[PDB]
Design a protein around this motif. Structure first.
Motif, mmCIF file in Angstrom:
data_model
loop_
_atom_site.group_PDB
_atom_site.id
_atom_site.type_symbol
_atom_site.label_atom_id
_atom_site.label_comp_id
_atom_site.label_asym_id
_atom_site.label_seq_id
_atom_site.Cartn_x
_atom_site.Cartn_y
_atom_site.Cartn_z
ATOM 1 N N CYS A 1 -5.987 4.140 30.866
ATOM 2 C CA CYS A 1 -5.396 2.852 31.262
ATOM 3 C C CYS A 1 -4.050 2.691 30.602
ATOM 4 O O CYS A 1 -3.929 2.822 29.387
ATOM 5 C CB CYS A 1 -6.303 1.670 30.901
ATOM 6 S SG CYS A 1 -5.621 0.078 31.407
ATOM 7 N N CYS B 1 -9.744 -5.863 31.045
ATOM 8 C CA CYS B 1 -8.599 -5.236 30.391
ATOM 9 C C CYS B 1 -7.952 -6.165 29.347
ATOM 10 O O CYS B 1 -7.574 -7.314 29.651
ATOM 11 C CB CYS B 1 -7.564 -4.805 31.430
ATOM 12 S SG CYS B 1 -6.216 -3.795 30.772
ATOM 13 N N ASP C 1 -2.352 -0.024 30.302
ATOM 14 C CA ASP C 1 -2.244 -1.321 29.626
ATOM 15 C C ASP C 1 -3.004 -1.378 28.292
ATOM 16 O O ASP C 1 -2.433 -1.781 27.275
ATOM 17 C CB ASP C 1 -2.756 -2.440 30.539
ATOM 18 C CG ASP C 1 -1.973 -2.548 31.831
ATOM 19 O OD1 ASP C 1 -0.886 -1.939 31.931
ATOM 20 O OD2 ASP C 1 -2.451 -3.254 32.743
ATOM 21 N N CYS C 2 -4.286 -0.993 28.301
ATOM 22 C CA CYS C 2 -5.129 -1.082 27.093
ATOM 23 C C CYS C 2 -5.435 0.256 26.418
ATOM 24 O O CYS C 2 -5.811 0.268 25.243
ATOM 25 C CB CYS C 2 -6.447 -1.783 27.409
ATOM 26 S SG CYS C 2 -7.566 -0.827 28.418
ATOM 27 N N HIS D 1 -8.042 -3.306 35.306
ATOM 28 C CA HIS D 1 -7.386 -2.253 34.543
ATOM 29 C C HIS D 1 -6.338 -1.593 35.431
ATOM 30 O O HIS D 1 -6.131 -2.020 36.570
ATOM 31 C CB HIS D 1 -8.410 -1.236 34.024
ATOM 32 C CG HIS D 1 -9.214 -1.735 32.871
ATOM 33 N ND1 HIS D 1 -8.776 -1.646 31.568
ATOM 34 C CD2 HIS D 1 -10.422 -2.342 32.820
ATOM 35 C CE1 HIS D 1 -9.683 -2.165 30.762
ATOM 36 N NE2 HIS D 1 -10.692 -2.598 31.496
HETATM 37 ZN ZN ZN Z 1 -6.993 -1.597 30.541
#
Ligand code: ZN
Ligand code: ZN
Length: 402
Positions: free
Chosen positions: A179, A198, A181-182, A149
């Motif tokens: 996070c 992730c 990214d997610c 992550h």
């Molecule tokens: Zn993530």
């Protein structure tokens, strides 16, 4: 239910800042500090001015290191000192504030929670929910079934809960990490425990279920939750004559798919007769929704008063006290409740076919729309009768109380 109230209740109990005003013009006072500024006084001096009440605070100049300032704070019946720094924002540690008042607010919340719930916080993380609740991509449900992550410090507008250990994320700012990214929301320390699983597509999916009622309403700018309107519209549409409506439950699996339908699609979620033939699926998703609210529809701060009303014998004062309980609720919870009780009133009118009176409807909804804020859940079980009768009263006399 799933999300834990303890640390959220604690934050509510935390003492507020009390600026000790120096009614004083002080030489070389920095233009960024105000009436709390006291210059170079002794610690005994600070002690004597802080003793008056819990959360009292002042800023003073350090005797050991002159030209540097110290926030002196009353907490735990003693004086805690913090070094202050300033570069356009005020800060003692990692967090950067727009005002001392804010800084001290976050300070006292931290001291309160970290001191009172030390063991609890130490152990919040045994038996985590992460691998059991939520979503992933193979969007599927984790409970159906490598990228590190990328956690950054985040400031949550509206109360949010940690999606690893299920506990409240406390503080006035930077209460956790998110996070990039997610989009997963967790505590700083919980961040190091989350697996390298992730799934960046998860950012795209803005959640509805398990999101704070008030927070969700403001984010979308609509009167009530879209889940509440759509399920209610769907239920009354295909008919309120179905037997055991709200007491009978559809397939668990498909109720969760409806929940997933709301979390992925929102206003465009398909809950038609075509897609889910059994109304009991929709009733279960509506029930589920309330059961995922971090703060339940009838808030923890309103709970005692509501339970009080259900103990009173006189039908008039009961109805008067119960009305006074509705004022204790926030605006979003309140109009959500109003709409629900009006829907449940309409369903009882069809008792001859669905066999669902206010009482037995009140059997289903009491525990869903109410949780006691008491630590002992098994003890809190004695209230179930009164949670059950409250909703029952709310259904019958909805027409006058709203
Ligand atoms: Zn993530
Ligand atoms: Zn956590």
């Amino acid at each position: 239910g799933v999300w834990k109230s303890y640390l959220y209740q604690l934050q509510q109990e935390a003492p507020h800042p009390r600026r000790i005003t120096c009614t004083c013009e002080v030489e070389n006072r920095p233009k960024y500090y105000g009436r709390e500024f006291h210059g170079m006084i002794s610690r005994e001096a600070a002690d004597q001015l802080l003793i008056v009440a819990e959360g009292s605070y002042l800023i003073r100049e350090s005797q050991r290191q002159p030209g540097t300032y110290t926030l002196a704070l009353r907490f735990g019946s003693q004086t805690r000192n913090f070094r202050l720094y300033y570069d356009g924002k005020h800060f003692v540690g990692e967090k950067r504030f727009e005002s001392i008042h804010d800084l001290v607010t976050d300070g006292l919340i931290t001291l309160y929670i970290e001191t009172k719930a030390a063991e609890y916080i130490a152990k919040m993380t045994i038996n985590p929910i992460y691998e059991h609740v939520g979503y992933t991509t193979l969007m599927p449900v984790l409970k159906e079934t490598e990228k590190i992550h990328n956690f950054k410090v985040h400031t949550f507008r509206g109360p949010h809960w940690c999606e690893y250990c299920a506990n409240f994320m406390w503080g006035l700012i930077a209460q956790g990490v998110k996070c990039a990214d997610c989009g997963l929301n967790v505590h700083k320390q919980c961040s190091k425990m989350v697996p390298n699983d992730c799934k960046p597509d998860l950012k795209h999916v803005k959640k509805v279920y398990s999101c704070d009622l008030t927070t969700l309403v403001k984010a979308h700018t609509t009167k009530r939750p879209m889940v509440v309107d759509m399920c209610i519209r769907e239920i009354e549409s295909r008919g309120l004559n179905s037997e055991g409506l709200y007491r009978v439950s559809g397939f668990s699996d498909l109720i969760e798919d409806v929940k997933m339908a709301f979390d992925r699609d929102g206003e465009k979620a398909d809950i038609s007769v075509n897609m889910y033939e059994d109304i009991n699926i929709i009733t279960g998703a509506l029930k589920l929704y309330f059961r995922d609210l971090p703060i339940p529809l009838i808030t923890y701060d309103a709970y005692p008063k509501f339970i009080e009303s259900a103990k009173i014998m006189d039908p008039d004062e009961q109805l008067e006290t119960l009305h006074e309980a509705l004022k204790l609720l926030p605006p979003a919870h309140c109009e959500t409740l109003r709409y629900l009780m009006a829907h449940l009133k309409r369903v009882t009118l069809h008792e001859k076919e669905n066999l669902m009176n206010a009482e037995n409807l009140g059997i289903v909804f009491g525990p869903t729309l109410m949780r006691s804020p008491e630590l002992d859940a098994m003890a809190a079980l004695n209230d179930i009768r009164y949670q059950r009768l409250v909703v029952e009263l709310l259904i019958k006399n909805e027409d006058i109380l709203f």
